[PDB]
């Protein structure tokens, strides 16, 4: 379990932006999109995300950065498919 979130609140000051960011992350894991960045003790995604905040490998910047990378990683695949929509012309 995670008894106190204090370490994460130091990492993100607001303590509210903490709830949001850890939330955004917990869904990346809970709906089966990614895997954890730190050993899972059988702790549910709620706490796994929090350990990730405390250990400094997850925050709003990285996720926006990480997500922004995936935007271009998927945009590369569909590259031929959507350019095939030349049917506009």
């Amino acid at each position: 379990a995670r008894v106190t979130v204090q370490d994460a609140v130091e990492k993100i000051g607001n303590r509210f932006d903490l709830v949001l960011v850890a939330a955004r992350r917990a869904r990346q894991m809970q709906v089966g999109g990614k895997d954890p960045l730190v050993p899972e003790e059988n702790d549910k995604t709620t706490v796994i995300a929090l350990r990730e905040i405390e250990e400094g490998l997850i925050n709003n910047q990285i996720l926006d950065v990480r997500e922004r990378q995936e935007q271009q990683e998927q945009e590369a695949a569909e590259l031929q498919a959507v350019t095939a929509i030349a049917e506009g012309r």
Partner: peptide, 16 residues
Amino acid sequence: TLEAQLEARALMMSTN
């Protein structure tokens, strides 16, 4: 909801 779990733990938790 996931957001409700994290609100409870980081705000409404006893220890906090």
